C-alpha cells in the first residue's frame, strides 16, 4: 500500500509547517490583470481625457472635442486635469455632483434657455482666460448676462422640464474684483441672482473683493447645480452678475458608480471588474492587484501568495501512514492518488485505487469550491471623492477601507493555513484507511512487514490480487 | 457467541453540509439561522415606538392642522413614519438639518409640548395668518404650533420675544422665515422692505433675511417658509427680534434623552407585544446568532446574513470518515439501538439484544452540546438602529454607510458559512473518532479470545453469558479462559 | 518498554470547542492587557500638550494659554474633554473640527508675524476686554487684532500677505458681531459694514449679524472665527468697512501623516511607545489587547475578551486519537526531557526518557503554530478617537456603528479561532503520542505482549544496548 509522487516543486504552507511541497495545488489569489482600460458590463466609461467634469459641463472651449456618450458606466477622469473652470472660480457640492454623474443610464443635453432670447442684455461677454484662438471666448453652455447700453433691466427666464427626464442645471454668480467693475459690466450695484423651483429657493449677492490673480483674473464665478424634477419649472431672475445656462442635462440613472483616476486610454475590451492598472476576468475569491477597483470583484488583500493545497505530500501526519511507515510515495503511479504495487509470480505493476482516489478527489473539489463559491461579490467604487474641507470624513472612509482589508487578510491568510493542514491530513487518513481495509481481510495469511506492504503465506496469482483489491478476498 | 461495537441510527432525513462533502444526511441537527418573525410591530423593551401614521417629523413638530389627530407619548424607543408620509410642510418649504432633528428625536426618554411664547402676547402684531393650504374645514389656517407674524393695521414694529429655559431639561425649538414671492407680497404682509430674522442664545447666533423670488406653485403657493431648530439648553435664553417674516414658535418640547436610535419605514401599526429586536416585516425573538428576515431592524439582533440555510450537525451520519470506522469497515448504523450514539449488539445463547454505551455517548453528547454553546454564545449582539436618514446632498455619506454595511454582511456571511462547513466535518468525524476508539477498547481487551471477524464484530471461542458481555462493556473483562485453544 | 507523555504542576487552563476549564502543561496567551499608566512619546516624537486648553484658544492666543510648552513637531495631542480656556471672548469656530484633524499630526509648526499689529495707523489697535483679563486689566486674543474706529473715523481697512515662508500656512480671522445698533457705531462709526477674505481659492464676504443675545463671561456680543490654508506663494487679502478681528501671525504647517486628538487629564512622561492609550502605553507583539478602544498608534485589535488563552502544551492528567488519557491512562511528571518519550523496565535499571526526534518536530509544529496565529496580524497606524459637532450626531454614530462592527468580528473570530485551534493542539499532541506507540508495536511485532496500558513486555532479554 503506497500514495503517489511525481515531479512537483509546488510548496504551499500549513500552520504547523512550511514550505511544504504537494503533488497539486490552487492558487486562490487573482494577481493578473489585462493591462487595459475596458468597457464594464458592455458599457464604456465617460472619457474625460484632459477635462475635469467642471470643464465638461459648463463647456470650457478646451473640451470641444470630447467623445461624449449618451450612456456610461464610470468616469475616468486625469489626477489633476488641466481643463477645469478656465475662469477662475468654485463649484458648489462638486463631489456630490461627481457622484451623481458617475453612472448614467442616459445623459443628453439640451438647450432650455437659448441664446438669443436674452434681448435687451449684452450676451456675447467673454473673457481671453477662456481663449479660443487668442480670441475671447466662455464656457460654451453658459451666458454671461452684462449691461446693454447703460441699461440692465431686471433679467427674467424660466424653463418647464418637459423632456420627460430629470433635468441638471447648472448656473453662476460672477463676483467682480471692485466697484468700477460691478458698474461697467452690470450698471446697477446691489444686485442679486434668484434661483427657484419646487425645491430650491437661492437668492446670492455677489461677493465683490480684492484676490490674487488666477489665469490673470481677479474676479471669480461661482458655480451651483440643481436636479429640475419632472414637470417641474425653474425660474432665473436677477438685476445683475447671473452667468445663465443655456443648455441644461437630461439625466436618468440608474446605479451610481465612481470615478477612476488614470491617464490611460479605453481599449474595446470586456470587463465585469476594472483597476486603474488593468482589467481583472477571474473566478478567484481574493485579488492584490489594485485597492481602488470598480465593479464586482474580489477580496482586495495584502497577501502575496494564498495556496491551496490539494494533492498530498510530495515524497520522494496525523495518521502516520503517509511520510510515515509508508516511507515513501511511488512515481510509478499515475491512475489516482492512492493504489497497491502487488509483487506476483505472474509480472509486477502499480494498480491505483480507483474508488477512493474519486472519492477523495471530490472532496478536495467540493472543498476549494465552499472556499471559492460562497463568497458573496457586489458592485462596488472604492475610489471616492472629498473636498479640502471634509478630511474627516476622508479618513473615516480609509479607516473603513483599511478595516476590511485586515479583515479578509487575516481570514483569508488563516482560512489557506488551516484548510491546508486539513488537507494533507485528510489524504493521510485515506491512505491510512486503504492500508487498515487491506489488512482486516488478509489477517493471518499474511505477514504484515510494517513498511505497509504484506507478504502473502500462501500464493496470489493475478486473479487473486483483483479480489484484494476489490474487497472480495477469502 | 459474539459482541457487536455500532452506532446510532434512525428515521431522521435532516441533510447538512460539510467541507468535503455535501446533502449528507445526519441523525441531530441544529439551526442557528433564525428566520421567523411574529408579523407584528412591537413595543421595543416595554417601551413603545412613536406612531406618525400618515404624518412626517416635520408636519407633527410644527402642528399641521392634518397631524391632530396623533397619539403623543411622553417616551419612546423609536419612530414608526410612512415612506413619502402624506402630511408634512403644509405650506410649502423645507426643513433646516431635518435629517439631524430625526436622529435626534429617534428615540426619547422624556418629551413634553410646552407653551413658551404666548401668541397673545404679540400684541402690536397680526397673529391670525393662515393659508387654505392649511386648510382646516374650508377655512384657512395655519401650524397649530407656529405664529404667522404680519402687519397689524399698517405698522410692523420690531418683534422682540425671549424665553428663558426653566422647565429644568433641554427644550427643542423650532422658528421659521417666511419667503414671499413678490415684493408687492412681502409689502401687504409686513409694510417694510429690507426684514431681517434674528435669533440668539449661548450657542446659536443667526440673522436670515427673506428670499424674496419667482417660484412654481407648490400646494397653490409660491411663497415659501423656510425651518431651523436649536437645542436651548437648561437655564439658557432664546432671543428672537424681526422687523418681518418670522413665523415664531409657540411652543417648545422639553426633551430628554436617553441613547439615540432611529427611524422604522412602515405602514403597519403598533399591536402591544413584545420585543427585544424589531424588524419592517415584524419582532424576532431569537437565542440564535445569524437571521435573514430583513436588514433593517432596530434593537438587539442577530448578524443578518445573506444565507438561506445554516444547519449544524450535532448528531452523527446516519447510516441504515477519517477514522474509517462509520460507513467504514462498520458498514452501517442499527435503527434497533436508541439509548444512546454508540454501544453494542451481543449474540448469546440467552438472548440477542442492543445496548448504548452510556459513558461515551454521554461524553459525545457533552462535547456536541459545547460545541453548538460556543457558535452561539460567543456572539456579542448589541443595541443598533442600522436603518439611516441622508438628505439629498448627502449621497456621498449615505453610500458610505452602505458600504460599510454590505461590508460586514459580507464578512459574517462568508464566515458564518464557512464556519457551519467547517465545523460540520469536523464533528462527523468527531463521532467516527468516537466509534473508532470505542471499537478499538474493547478490541485491546479480548485479545486471543476472539476472532475479530472485520465488520465490527468479535466472535468469542468460549462461552460469553450475560454475565461474561457485562464485564466486557464495563471494561472489566479478563481472560484467563482459555478455552480456546481447545 | 513503556510508551507515554509528560505532565507537571501546571495549573494554567484553557478551553476547546468541545471542552472547558481543561487543564494543559503550556499555554501561551495571545491577549495583551496591560499598560505603563504613562502617556508617552509616539515613535520618539511628542504630543502636543494643551494642558487647560483648547485648540481654539491655543491658536488665538487666549492668554490664559500663555505659559503652553509648543513643540515645533508632534504625533498626536493632548487635550482635556471639556478645556477651561477657549474663546474666552464668547464665540465660534468655524470648521473647528475639521482644523483640529489638521492639526491631529505636524511635521514642522511655527508661528510667523505676517501682518504686524503697528501697521495699522488710522486705526485703533487696543481694543480689548476684561473676558479676557490678564489681572484685572481687559486684554485680547495675544494672536489677534482688534480693528476698530479712530478718533470717530473708520477708513476701510486693507491688508495682504505673500506667503513667502516657503509652507503652507494657517491663518485665521474673525468677525466681530456687536450687541446692537449702537455698539456697532461706537466701535467702527459705520454701519452697513463687511469683511472681506481673499486668496487664489477662497472667496468670502461677511457681514455682521448685530442681535439680542444671552450674556457668556458677561458678553452678548460673539467672534466668530474662520480659517484657511494659504498655499506657498499665494497671497490673502483682508478688506472691511468694520466688525473685521484681523490675524497678526500665522502659523508655518508642513504635514506629514495626520493621527488624531486624545482626551486625558494626565500629562507627558518622556516613555517611548507605538500605541498609546489613554491609560497608558502598549509595548506588546501580541495580536489583541483589550485595554481601552480609543488608541493612537500601530496597536492589536482591540477585542471585548477577558481571556484569549492558546493552548501550546499537551492536556495535564496526573482525544481523537485514544492515546493520551485513554488507553495510556495518565502522563509521567518523571519526564522532563520532551513532551513524548520511554519508561523501559530492565534488569540493568529503570528510567524516563524522552524521544527527542519526536518532540522536536511537536515543538517545532506548536511555535508555527503560534507564530501564524501572531504574525499574520497586519497592524497599521490609527487614531481611533474622533471629533464630531453638535449636528454631526449621524455622521458620530456612523462612526460608532463601524468602531463597533470590527469590534464584533475580531472578538468573535479571536474567540473562536482560538477554541478551534486548541482542540487541534490537543489532538495533535495525541496523534503526535499515538503514532510514537504505533512506530514502537509495528517493531517488536511477536517478540512482546502488549500489555494494552502503552507498554510492551519483552519475552527475551533486552538490555541497555537493545533499548
Aim: hydrophobic share 30%; with cysteine; proline share 4%.
Amino acid at each position: 500500500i503506497g500514495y503517489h509522487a511525481n515531479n512537483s516543486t509546488e510548496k504551499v504552507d500549513t500552520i504547523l509547517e512550511r514550505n511544504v511541497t504537494v503533488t497539486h495545488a490552487k492558487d486562490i489569489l487573482e494577481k493578473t490583470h489585462n493591462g487595459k482600460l475596458c468597457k464594464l458590463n458592455g458599457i464604456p466609461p465617460l472619457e474625460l481625457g484632459d477635462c475635469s467634469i467642471a470643464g465638461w459641463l459648463l463647456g470650457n472651449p478646451e473640451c470641444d472635442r470630447l467623445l461624449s456618450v449618451p450612456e456610461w458606466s464610470y468616469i475616468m477622469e486625469k489626477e489633476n486635469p488641466r481643463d477645469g473652470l478656465c475662469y477662475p472660480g468654485s463649484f458648489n457640492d462638486y463631489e456630490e455632483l461627481k457622484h451623481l454623474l458617475s453612472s448614467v443610464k442616459h445623459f443628453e443635453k439640451v438647450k432650455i434657455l437659448p441664446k438669443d432670447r436674452w434681448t435687451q442684455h449684452t450676451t456675447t461677454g467673454g473673457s481671453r482666460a477662456c481663449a479660443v484662438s487668442g480670441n475671447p471666448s466662455f464656457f460654451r453652455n453658459m451666458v454671461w448676462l452684462t449691461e446693454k447700453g447703460s441699461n440692465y433691466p431686471v433679467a427674467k427666464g424660466s424653463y418647464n422640464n418637459t423632456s420627460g427626464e430629470q433635468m441638471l442645471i447648472i448656473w453662476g454668480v460672477h463676483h467682480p474684483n471692485d466697484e468700477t467693475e460691478q458698474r461697467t459690466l452690470y450698471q446697477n450695484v446691489g444686485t442679486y441672482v434668484s434661483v427657484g423651483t419646487s425645491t430650491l429657493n437661492k437668492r446670492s449677492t455677489p461677493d465683490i473683493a480684492t484676490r490674487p490673480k488666477v489665469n490673470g483674473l481677479g474676479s471669480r464665478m461661482e458655480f451651483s447645480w440643481t436636479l429640475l424634477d419632472m414637470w417641474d419649472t425653474i425660474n432665473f431672475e436677477s438685476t445683475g452678475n447671473l452667468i445663465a445656462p443655456e443648455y441644461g442635462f437630461k439625466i436618468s440613472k440608474r446605479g451610481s458608480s465612481g470615478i477612476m483616476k488614470t491617464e490611460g486610454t479605453l481599449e474595446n475590451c470586456e470587463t465585469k471588474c476594472q483597476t486603474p492598472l488593468g482589467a481583472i476576468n477571474t473566478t478567484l475569491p481574493f485579488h492584490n492587484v489594485h485597492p481602488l477597483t470598480i465593479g464586482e470583484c474580489p477580496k482586495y488583500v495584502k497577501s502575496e501568495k494564498l495556496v491551496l493545497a490539494t494533492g498530498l505530500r510530495n515524497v520522494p501526519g496525523l495518521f502516520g501512514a503517509i511520510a510515515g511507515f509508508i516511507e515513501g510515495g511511488w512515481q510509478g503511479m499515475i491512475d489516482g492518488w492512492y493504489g497497491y504495487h502487488h509483487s506476483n509470480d505472474q509480472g509486477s505493476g502499480y494498480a491505483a485505487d480507483k474508488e477512493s482516489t474519486q472519492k477523495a478527489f471530490d472532496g478536495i473539489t467540493n472543498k476549494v469550491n465552499s472556499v471559492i463559491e460562497k463568497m458573496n461579490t457586489q458592485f462596488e467604487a472604492v475610489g471616492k471623492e472629498f473636498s479640502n474641507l471634509e478630511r474627516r470624513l476622508e479618513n473615516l472612509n480609509k479607516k473603513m477601507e483599511d478595516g476590511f482589508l485586515d479583515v479578509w487578510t487575516y481570514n483569508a491568510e488563516l482560512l489557506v493555513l488551516m484548510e491546508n493542514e486539513r488537507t494533507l491530513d485528510f489524504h493521510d487518513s485515506n491512505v491510512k484507511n486503504l492500508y487498515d481495509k487491506v489488512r482486516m481481510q488478509l489477517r493471518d495469511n499474511v505477514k504484515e512487514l510494517g513498511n505497509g506492504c504484506f507478504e502473502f503465506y500462501h500464493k496470489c496469482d493475478d486473479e487473486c490480487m483483483n479480489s484484494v483489491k476489490n474487497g472480495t478476498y477469502d
